[PDB]
């Protein structure tokens, strides 16, 4: 109780201290922290264009949804308070979700014990109440005190609101409400397109909570799936139709979703698209954009075949994949799946090459600003340095995720067959 309040106080104090210093303007302009879809300056530009009588979507600078326009129209003066509130909200939601999940896990593990479906000598692999006591508080601390999250907050990037919506989706799903879950997933899909892939894991968790078997010759399964899908799609339809009536146009749609899907702007970031499409042969551009945006939606089905009985680990992997392979990535997207590492640290004995990967990620994080400076202000370097750093960062992320997946499977094998 007191630990959570103390953590919140420390996080708010650090953010408030950094808001008043001489580094806020420097932080607000980093290409690693803001994107053409997240910058605060584009928000104020759109609001000014509306007061000059021009449509915000008639140019090439503003790519935000109308709901952001409404919110910040009413709260432009109190901007710095909003982001603190949102970060606290996502931390608290994660805390309570993890508490409930741990209860389910211990109860499920306890039930198997008497059905004696575990090997005779498998102990020291059994979860105990003394070790799961401080997992939620840790999760909250890892989210709040991550430098990526603090940097995102001081820059007033819109990614914080997206993270809050995802965290509320997780909280409502684990607590067992499907209507609110569908609403929050629709709100997350409205802002960015990729969160639609989290539809399958949440449905699997809900079905498992109802004790409904998942089979092709079942009746409850199909009815539940149909109801959930209908609620989600209706939510999306109503939000879009409501968005039409703010400015009486459909122009926001190509400005947002077309921009995400087609990647016209070539500003550098920590992703894999910008330099590839600045150095492309025009004959193959369509084929390559199609391939590299199918890659994101590719893994959901086989992962759902393998991880059918473990929906939450499935969610964690899917969020990491979205963060790695999106068109305009930011460190704020990276922090969200890093917040989940404490949940999976009982798998530490089966991890291999964790040390080198952590060191490499840490080094690349510091090497981004120095090489940006040497390229853009000194003139002593070129874009190849920056491209190499982005390549190394993404490779390290992929290796780390694969390691966690391997450790999970190895522990399952040892649980079933004997240590």
């Amino acid at each position: 109780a007191a630990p959570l309040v103390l953590v919140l106080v420390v996080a708010v104090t650090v953010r408030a201290a950094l808001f008043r210093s001489s580094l806020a303007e420097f932080i607000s302009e980093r290409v690693e922290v803001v994107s053409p879809l997240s910058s605060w300056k584009r928000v104020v530009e759109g609001l000014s264009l509306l007061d000059l009588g021009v449509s915000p979507y008639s140019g090439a600078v503003f790519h935000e949804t109308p709901l952001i326009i409404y919110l910040f129209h009413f709260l432009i003066d109190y901007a710095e308070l909003v982001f603190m509130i949102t970060d606290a909200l996502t931390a608290i939601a994660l805390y309570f979700a993890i508490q409930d999940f741990n209860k389910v896990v211990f109860k499920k593990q306890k039930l198997l014990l008497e059905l004696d479906q575990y090997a005779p000598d498998v102990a020291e692999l059994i979860r105990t109440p003394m070790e799961m006591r401080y997992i939620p508080l840790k999760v909250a601390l890892f989210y709040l005190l991550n430098p990526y999250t603090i940097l995102s907050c001081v820059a007033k990037s819109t990614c914080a609101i997206n993270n809050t919506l995802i965290a509320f989706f997780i909280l409502t799903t684990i607590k067992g409400s499907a209507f609110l879950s569908a609403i929050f997933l629709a709100l997350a899909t409205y802002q960015s397109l990729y969160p639609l892939t989290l539809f399958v894991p949440g449905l699997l968790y809900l079905l498992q909570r109802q004790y409904i078997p998942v089979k092709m010759k079942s009746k409850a399964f199909w009815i539940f799936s149909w109801e959930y899908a209908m609620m989600y799609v209706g939510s999306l339809v109503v939000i879009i139709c409501l968005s039409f009536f703010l400015l009486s146009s459909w122009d926001f749609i190509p400005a947002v979703y077309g921009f995400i899907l087609s990647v016209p702007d070539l500003t550098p970031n920590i992703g894999l698209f910008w330099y590839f499409f600045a150095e492309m042969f025009e004959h193959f551009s369509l084929f390559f954009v199609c391939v590299f945006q199918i890659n994101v939606f590719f893994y959901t089905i086989p992962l759902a075949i393998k991880l059918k009985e473990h929906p939450i680990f499935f969610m964690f992997i899917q969020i990491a994949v979205i963060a790695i392979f999106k068109s305009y990535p930011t460190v704020g997207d990276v922090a969200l799946y890093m917040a989940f590492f404490p949940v999976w640290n009982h798998l530490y004995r089966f991890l291999r090459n964790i040390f080198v990967l952590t060191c490499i990620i840490i080094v690349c994080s510091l090497l981004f600003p120095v090489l940006w400076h040497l390229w853009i202000y000194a003139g002593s370097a070129n874009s190849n340095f920056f491209y190499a750093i982005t390549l190394t960062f993404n490779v390290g992320q992929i290796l780390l995720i694969s390691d966690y997946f391997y450790a999970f499977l190895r522990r399952e094998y040892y649980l079933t067959h004997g240590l």
Partner: protein, 48 residues
Amino acid sequence: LASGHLASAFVASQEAVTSSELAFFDPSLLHLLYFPDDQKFAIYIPLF
């Protein structure tokens, strides 16, 4: 021309020459605008 109607034949021949030369000199028939078919394997090998 075989039937002996000179005026209609003249008009038809005018249309024939106009259409043929319109097709022949089209700006899109320049070989230099298209990617060489020899180098495509370089592109498809790395992800195949």
